[model samples]
Target: GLCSENGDCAADECCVDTVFEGDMVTRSCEKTTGNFTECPGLTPIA
Candidate 1:
């Protein structure tokens, strides 16, 4: 799903996506948790 803009997500959440090889893996608003901070390489929308 497309987030349209970064404001679409929560403060601790961001619009990000996972990519497999050269294709889009998964796209959504995710939260920063555990040993992971922010998306792997993706950033918030808009």
Candidate 2:
């Protein structure tokens, strides 16, 4: 399937959010400075 030129994909997948574990706490990668990149979670396929 396709859309207009400016249209977005209807079957696109989202990137997963990364979780970092520390000594006593767990935090997201967003807190870091230019460290890791975020990715999408798993998607179900038929």
Candidate 3:
């Protein structure tokens, strides 16, 4: 997963099979306390 200073998720974390019509470039999680926590899918943006 790749994130930028402004919380931008790169290819590894934003490239999925489906089409995404949102920011598709950001994520921010301060903490997680779960064994099976799932984030957003990776959608191809190129």
> Per-candidate TM vs. native?
0.35, 0.18, 0.19
Q: lDDT of each structure?
A: 0.55, 0.28, 0.37
Model 2 misplaced stretches (Cα beyond 4 Å): 1-11, 23-46
Against the true structure, what is every candidate's RMSD?
6.7, 14.1, 8.7
Instruction: List the candidate 3 regions with Cα displacement exceeding 4 Å.
Output: 1-25, 28-31, 42-46
* TM-score-sorted candidate list, best first: 1, 3, 2
Question: Best by lDDT, which number?
Answer: 1
Q: Of the pair 2 and 3, which is ahead by lDDT?
A: 3
TM-score winner? 1
CA-RMSD of model 3: 8.7
lDDT tens digits, residue span 1-46, model 2: 2223221222232223233443342212122235543323433321
Per residue, candidate 1 scores C-alpha lDDT tens digits across 1-46 of: 6665663566666665444455445666656567434534653433
Candidate 3 residue lDDT tens string, 1-46: 5443322333222222333465554433322245433344553453
Model 2 lDDT vs. the true structure? 0.28
Candidate structures ordered by lDDT, highest first = 1, 3, 2
Question: Which wins on TM-score, candidate 1 or candidate 3?
Answer: 1
* Predicted structure 1: lDDT: 0.55
Among residues 3 or more apart in sequence or in different chains, the pairs in candidate 1 whose N, CA or C atoms overlap within 3 Å are: none
